[PDB]
Design a protein around this nucleic acid. Structure first.
Lengths: 208, 214, 107, 214
RNA sequence: ACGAGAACAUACGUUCUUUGAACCAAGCUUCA
């Protein structure tokens, strides 16, 4: 049995994922439709970092293969014997609200100008940062496959923990300097094929 | 008498199947996708699609787990994908073909290449430095027109076999096809799923084409 | 050789164990797609009352093979062929109805 | 878990910050203020607040002048605002956010525009002809809420960390925040410096709320 | 009236499992 967890990532401040024309530091985008994109690798990595740091005694210093059983069963592993298949399955997230952004007569991304005033020179050496704008939304869905009936409650508690841990941190790029602040909303879980018995408890421990 | 199931595998996110470290001096890009050797198109092998469908179907007929050898699968899985035992050896009713990229003209219409490169980190929690890694992927929205040959040898099993085939396609709808799929890539979807007959019309083809096109 | 490509390739396949989630690769030489093989098959005509049914069976074998593979790991991708330019010419002995075989095989 | 620093920065002098020379329409405004792009209202960047904040702490700890790059500042600043060494990178703990305007309605009650333009004349050499020019500031008295996030990674350092955050804010009321501030712009003042946490009430909130309420 | 007739080197097998493009950086300097 498999479950799908669907929500929205709304950008409270600007965001800037990725890099590598005649301009400095572009964002990583969709390659066909040129939409700004959250890579699912970046969302999975930041969620894994925050959830592994909170599901621990404070801080997190070891390799991702050496995490707790909840983290390793939620995000996968690669060992010579203790290899596990991940239960979460993240996806690349394209920009959903181009209609909402295009209503306000603003581009989906914009260029941020900022200096580095050297102290002994007091001269600007300016640089351009492309940022997808604030108020942008990103509809995601993560596929959760159910293997243990007695562990789906703890797995979903950890998933909600990772969500509201990411609500108090940023998502990629120059984050401490203004960028990256996100927030999660419209969080729900649905079943892929054939209804789970305990779906209401998951919608109420994930809808809070 | 033999049936053909034709459809399209559309890439919802990027898809990274395959790779040979090519001898040509390509430069400072690593980890390419498997390509067609003559027409220079990225390719979905039939072996990869067959293996992922077989794993998801053998996993789905479950209650318990899936941990066995492929030859000790469920008998419906052995009659769909074949088995090679010493005595209980069954011919595979399915024949997969290598799928190459179809809508190259439409990717050229939007003036963009057929495969792209995604830059990807791994920050080590000791040192907090990033080591960038180039992973060549196929652009999402690319379409891969496949055809699988179904040879029918028992009328009393074909409806259950196509029920299981549609279930395997549905299990691929909520999983990924090849490569770094847990990190975003690999997500596919099946479109235009239809069945046609090779030669000589099957009489009850409508129930197969309506439980495959559901 | 116009495309600066070899006559043959190599194809990589893994095998994911379901118990232990680990892949062991293997390699297969394949002759690449877009390769063409000009063939000629010789038929000797013992009896004219059976030649049309024989050629009907030969074309049946050819398109039956066109919906199957030709050797090797054909269930897992490879092997798919397509016969083209199928034509019949008589070698020795003038055969009075040769165009009917040329159309039952060339259809 | 984490504890945030809610607050409100207000302007006692018309503040100038940011800039662009756009292709579409310059208009009768030279060097405009940086503004938020969707909500179209002005914005203190978190980058600007971090840069001026760090420059003032650099004026505070090693006093007077420094003539030094900001990757080799004092070690508390390397822990707080972040640093990138050769391979042994010492990470940040202090995350700023793009500060945008909150009190739109109480300026709309008095029919006052959110931003301010002034006609800054310039008298040249003894020929003595005015050289008029227009700069765009934001009106003094406008309020700006901020929510600085603070990861707790040392229990026995958050005392000194919040005391030097208050020392930096205390050094920032006696300074401008960016722009043409040297000739009468940019002067700020802090108010309503309330601290709340994400969950719980651990790593005691009372001492930090008192040392930011001082 | 060919050391020859008959005979698919064929069957089962995911190039797959790990990982944030991060960190360092007042659009500022002289303008009645």
């Amino acid at each position: 049995m498999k479950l799908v967890i669907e929500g929205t990532i709304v950008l409270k401040t600007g965001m800037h994922i990725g890099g590598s024309g005649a301009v400095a530091s572009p964002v990583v985008r969709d390659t066909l439709t040129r939409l700004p994109l959250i890579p699912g690798s970046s969302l999975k990595g930041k969620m894994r970092y925050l959830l592994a740091k909170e599901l621990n005694n404070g801080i997190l210093l070891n390799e991702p293969n050496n995490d707790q059983d909840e983290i390793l069963r939620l995000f996968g592993s690669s060992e010579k014997d203790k290899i596990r298949r991940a239960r979460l399955k993240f996806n690349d997230i394209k920009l959903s609200n181009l209609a909402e952004l295009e209503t306000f007569n603003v581009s989906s991304t914009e260029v941020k100008f900022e200096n580095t005033i050297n102290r002994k020179t007091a001269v600007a050496n300016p640089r351009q940062i492309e940022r997808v704008i604030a108020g942008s939304k990103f509809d995601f869905e993560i596929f959760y496959n159910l293997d243990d009936i007695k562990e789906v409650e703890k797995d979903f508690e950890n998933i909600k923990q990772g969500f509201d841990l990411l609500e108090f941190d940023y998502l990629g790029g120059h984050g401490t300097r203004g960028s990256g602040r996100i927030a999660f909303e419209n969080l729900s879980v649905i079943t892929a094929v054939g209804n789970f018995e305990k779906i209401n408890t998951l919608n109420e421990i994930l809808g809070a």
